[PDB]
């Protein structure tokens, strides 16, 4: 994963934002993209090939892994980190194309509608960030437990199957949904901030 | 996957495009080969490593997963990328023999040709986009069921095949659709903006 | 892993930091994320595809691995450092802040309250250090022996498992321990000059 | 695979190419570099691994798989890419060396003898992918089948031996025989531009 | 294994280093780190999972690569390397200190206590490369047989257990150890010079 | 393998170099290096791992691996790589060297030493290529055969292994062999050159 271009756009984003919002983008960087490439990919690499069903049922260990993780929990944490970036990218090209206008003006920060768009950012990437917690709740929970029972065909009545390192990877998760939380605090001082 | 030199050039079309195909740019960078390399190439990896069939014949499964994916979706993906970004570089090219026109003319924007050819840049993207998206509806729909029934021999009368993670590729084939049905729209925009 | 980002704002730290400081920067680069990425990633590589366990039960490698290695050392390392990292962080924006204040002041280093805030910052680097340290102790012990007895649910009774490389384990536990014990010095010396 | 240093040396010669030329190269870095490392690369990671054959002969798969592929098609590629490039490397020497003694004469563009490079490194190009495309076919021809018959000793009699991936190999062979016939037309355009 | 930071801060070293000492760090980065990234490494990478026992005992293969291999030669290395360069980052640590206390004192090379440091500086990579020399000759010798006999529990009296590579992991050994001794060799040169 | 520190100065050789030299260092980067990584590294990749015997021996793949490959081509085509390359370092810090003393003496180009240390880095570049050219020749000749017969202990009697991927690994020689001895020629055409 080479996320150097969004990183790129974002330390615009930096260059244009709050003292909240820099800290927010700080976050980002360092405990929600770096933790899931230095140590989370790592976690789930596995997830697929050390998951093990008690069967000689062929078939089974494949549907039953693809009921239990629909979706790996590090998929889900890219796209959620895509989405709540968007937000800051749209208010940068916003920033950008002001920019370029009062040059071409010229040729021939943060109030008026530039301030109406940073606040719309704000509030999209709070919803965002309440949505992927929220979604991550009802798929999976915040616990990986050891054991996921299965009864899906062709699998013969109900099968024991065992998950891969169950106990790191609810470690993982309990710290990327407090990461999650972190954020929807710092956006709210960020409301507050500008309120008051 | 180095999407490096591709990037470089984009960007040069990125200072040359309107604001729409900033905006359209970002989508390709953020939203198709972030992801791409960031999660689905992840997710396609053990497509053939972990496809089974419940057989004891010899190639079957070769074969089979042969007719089943006669391209995975994600090689799809990336020349899908490389055509929908090769009329942006056609349109920069022109950009940059004018330029370079200009500055020895001197020796011894959009408007005129190069907004022929911009717009020409606008339709033909947008062909390829529709060209591939139907492509891919008439090869694989837009589900991954986890059965495929193969009688291709040696496959001896019917084999049942089990795919590897069917609902994670089908979630990220419908993104995959998403993303390139907004990229359709951000063009359409593109042609009614420049109309009006 | 890609450490860039993080790098490139410790060294902006180290422009503001004490020669100490940076002493304390050039160990973590070397020490700890250079020797990480060198030499123990590689090591644990092979943490669970290289565990064994005396059993025909299946399942039982699993939980007994997972039982065994909670959270792998490397992962809590990464954690470790990330934190060890975050004060840094914060006293550095805090710098960044007041430069832009001085800056707009101006259109319209270590005392005072930024001397207050680095000070806080080798307060909570210490007790972070110790935290890790002690958690690291509780947890693991500062040794890996190959034996571990399992007797986790499906294993029968009690099975015995094989580590995967447990006295080259030991020793980069070790040397991790040490590197952290002398951030830890090099923090009391940091406080020990500022007193005096 | 690291193509930086020739790419940064091809971007040099782009400089001094004419636009056709340049065409030619970001043909070259587009649909060939580029599709090599995203997709055609993967396709071939599993070649041997995949290849299968119906016997209990210890070695035969392996004489089978290397009497069915002498080299690679990625490998071929590979080299037909370097090769093609080669001329432009020339030419770019020629011209640097030019640039360097009226640089010298001082202290103490394509006409000339450095028309007559170019058009000789536009010969050359053409000869050898030429070269190239006929050699593919006189190799492998421009589809690979699923079944190989395959004899060698130490196989018994006839063996059945199935490939991995025919339809997606056949896929991108012909895909790549057609981006080399587009860098033929780019050639012989260059040739009648120089020529009218 | 990313050794950025470190070859951009000993190539600062470079150029505050004599001559010698300039052959030191080339020697450094291209037989020692550039050797073991590109060829070492990967020769090293089976040294597990190619490793055989001739046992059917459940976990005798892992404890008997644990007491055969300690430590990696390849780690090994890697430490050796770090220790050797890091009393060179002392030395520059003093030199950019005293360096900024002139800048000061403006505000407001090798003799003194930087020839001393100097000196100190070769003294200790003397002793360092010197005790990683002696470690490796009392751990493992400078060859690698391809049987290890191995009594070690759970194995069953004693164990035939066969190498990966032995002759190949020979040459390497003796071509590091031959650079380490080039280095000593360069050191005292370093000292011999600076004493005439 | 990460060639970056080599190549940034062998570029500053470039510089200070001739033209047949730069011809040279041309040849070395895209026909050895960038050819080794590309292509022959994924060749050799699964040289033991699709390396077979027809035995039920404990360990005899191991040993007879061993033996019939003591190096594999690829570390020593690196080796020769570095060797190579060294005289061409030798002579840049001589270069650089009196460079520096030049601007020393303001304080306070191939002639002369200069030119006598260039011949002799001609002269070492050229017995480096030969010796390994020589040492290639008479450890495995120009071919690798499918067949290798191995009585080494513990094999019993006499046995079959089968190399992997011989021809693909016999063209990939004979082209490394080819480029060494351009390499030879070039550098003869340097001393003739020079000579006149």
Redesign the interface.
């Known amino acids: 994963?080479?996320?150097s271009?969004?990183?790129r756009?974002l330390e615009n984003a930096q260059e244009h934002s709050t003292?909240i919002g820099?800290?927010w983008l700080?976050v980002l960087?360092?405990?929600r993209?770096?933790?899931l490439?230095?140590?989370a990919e790592?976690?789930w690499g596995?997830e697929?090939?050390?998951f093990?069903?008690?069967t000689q049922q062929?078939?089974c260990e494949?549907?039953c892994?693809?009921?239990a993780?629909?979706?790996?929990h590090?998929?889900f944490w890219?796209?959620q980190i895509?989405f709540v970036?968007?937000p800051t990218?749209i208010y940068l090209?916003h920033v950008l194309?002001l920019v370029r206008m009062e040059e071409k003006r010229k040729e021939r920060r943060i109030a008026g509608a530039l301030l109406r768009t940073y606040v719309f950012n704000i509030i999209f990437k709070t919803l965002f960030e309440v949505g992927f917690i929220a979604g991550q709740y009802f798929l999976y929970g915040f616990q990986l437990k050891?054991?996921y029972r299965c009864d899906r065909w062709?699998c013969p009545n109900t099968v024991?199957?065992?998950?891969?390192?169950?106990?790191?990877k609810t470690?993982?998760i309990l710290?990327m949904l407090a990461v999650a939380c972190v954020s929807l605090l710092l956006n709210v001082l960020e409301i507050y901030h500008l309120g008051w």
């Open positions: 994963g080479d996320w271009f969004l990183g756009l003292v820099k800290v700080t960087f360092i405990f993209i770096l933790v490439g230095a140590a790592e976690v596995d697929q090939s050390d093990t069903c008690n062929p078939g494949n549907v892994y693809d009921r993780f629909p979706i790996s590090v998929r890219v796209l895509i970036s968007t990218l090209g194309h050891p054991l062709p024991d199957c065992f998950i891969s390192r169950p106990t790191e470690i993982f710290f």
